[PDB]
Amino acid sequence: MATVEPETTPTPNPPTTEEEKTESNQEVANPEHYIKHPLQNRWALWFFKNDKSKTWQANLRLISKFDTVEDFWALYNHIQLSSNLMPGCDYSLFKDGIEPMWEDEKNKRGGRWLITLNKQQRRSDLDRFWLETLLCLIGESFDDYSDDVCGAVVNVRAKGDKIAIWTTECENREAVTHIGRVYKERLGLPPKIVIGYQSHADTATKSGSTTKNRFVV
């Protein structure tokens, strides 16, 4: 026995709301019907991807900016989920005060550390290492010293995710090493992940290693 009729039954799906969805249901849950965390500063997020035909400078696109955790949070659930983590994709997170190499040129003259993330452990590593950075940038690990950190760029080579953070004043070795050595050390890169450190000063020297600027481990 069997009756064939033109009709398809809804395909059951697991509840999560983490597969590119605009709102779902998070109201009437607790007295906190509008809890927003006030950040000391405002950080905007830029997304630039280089295609095999055009330059990144021309493919520079902006995603959004936020001066409150509740803000970046709303974006996190819309950006964090393979929404735009395709090959050749990149995104930066710095102070909105930044400028196209005009007055905030100091961001380019500063310094930054580069980390190599692998999608293989993205589940725990990318989720933990990233979540920590966000809260660490604003208030954690780097502490108030983070105020110097101009921003961080994330470049994911196809499947390999990469994260980089740049300091406003490369001279602030206190943040450079303390936040860079603690982040890489606390993250557990030295004994596995190679975190290359690049300083703008290298432009006026380059060629082989000289001082604390151009080390990966």
* CATH number reported for the structural domain that contains residue 163 in this entry: 3.30.760.10
DSSP annotation of 22? S
DSSP annotation of 125? I
Report yes or no on 203 lying in a domain. yes
Report yes or no on 117 lying in a domain. yes
8 A C-beta contact, residue 39 and residue 68: yes
- Separation CA 163–CA 130 (nearest Å): 9
Exposure class string for 124-163: b at 16+ Cβ within 10 A, else e: ebbeebbeebbebbbeebbeeebebbbbbbbbbeeeebbb
Q: In the chain, what is the greatest distance between 2 CA atoms, to the nearest angstrom? A: 82
Angle between helices 127-139 and 69-79 (to 10 degrees): 160
Domain extent, residue 88, equals 37-217
Report yes or no on 5 lying in a domain. no
Question: 38-49 and 89-95: which strand pairing?
Answer: antiparallel
8 A C-beta contact, residue 72 and residue 135: no
Residue with tokens 């970046």: 72
- Separation CA 167–CA 32 (nearest Å): 35
Count Cβ atoms below 10 Å from residue 92 Cβ, excluding itself: 23
Enumerate residues 6+ apart whose C-beta is below 8 A from 200. Answer: 108, 109, 110, 111, 170
Report yes or no on 8 lying in a domain. no
Enumerate residues 6+ apart whose C-beta is below 8 A from 184. Answer: 113, 115, 190, 193, 195, 217
Report yes or no on 114 lying in a domain. yes
Instruction: Find residue 109's DSSP bridge partners.
Output: none
Report yes or no on 113 lying in a domain. yes
8 A C-beta contact, residue 35 and residue 69: no
Report yes or no on 167 lying in a domain. yes
Q: Is 38 helix (H, G, I), strand (E, B) or coil?
A: strand
Angle between helices 173-187 and 127-139 (to 10 degrees): 150
Q: How many domains does the chain have?
A: 1
Report yes or no on 22 lying in a domain. no
Binding residues for mRNA: 56-57, 102-103, 157-162, 205-207
- Separation CA 60–CA 87 (nearest Å): 15
Binding residues: 56-57, 102-103, 157-162, 205-207
Method by which this entry was solved: NMR
Instruction: Find residue 151's DSSP bridge partners.
Output: 94, 166
- Separation CA 194–CA 113 (nearest Å): 10
The residue among 166, 159, 52 whose CA lies nearest residue 116 is: 159
Question: 149-157 and 111-118: which strand pairing?
Answer: unpaired
Reading the block at residue 99, the tokens are: 């400028």
